[PDB]
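Predict the assembly for these five chains.
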Amino acid sequence: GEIAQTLKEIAKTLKEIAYTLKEIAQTLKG
Amino acid sequence: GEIAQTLKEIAKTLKEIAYTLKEIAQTLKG
Amino acid sequence: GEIAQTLKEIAKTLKEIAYTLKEIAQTLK
Amino acid sequence: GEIAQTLKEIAKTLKEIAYTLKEIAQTLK
Amino acid sequence: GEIAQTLKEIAKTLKEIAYTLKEIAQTLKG
């Protein structure tokens, strides 16, 4: 189903967002 | 219908958010 | 119905988040 | 049901995220 | 099924994102 596929894409993009925020948090502490 | 369309819009906005976070991460590294 | 209304709220809050992140990116640049 | 409840939780967490980003934007400005 | 499980994963990743943003906000206040 189309909805299940779009939700898997949303979940993957959110994992990327969470990882980039961990990089930003570390860069701000040096 | 509307649910499938709104989830595609959510997925598109999340890609924009992921990209702007990668730009912010790069700006903090010069 | 209820599901579609909650998803429209989620979509609207995500547009707000995307815009605030664009503002942050501009301030840092 | 479970799906309606999880979507309400997602909407609520996104309002928190939107607020924290607005606080970050103000700190940087 | 699959959709309920994907939505629980999305909710969990969003709680992590909310936490990391609070850590970033505190670092930016020193």
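The radius of gyration of chain D is 13 Å. The helical segments of chain D are 2-28.
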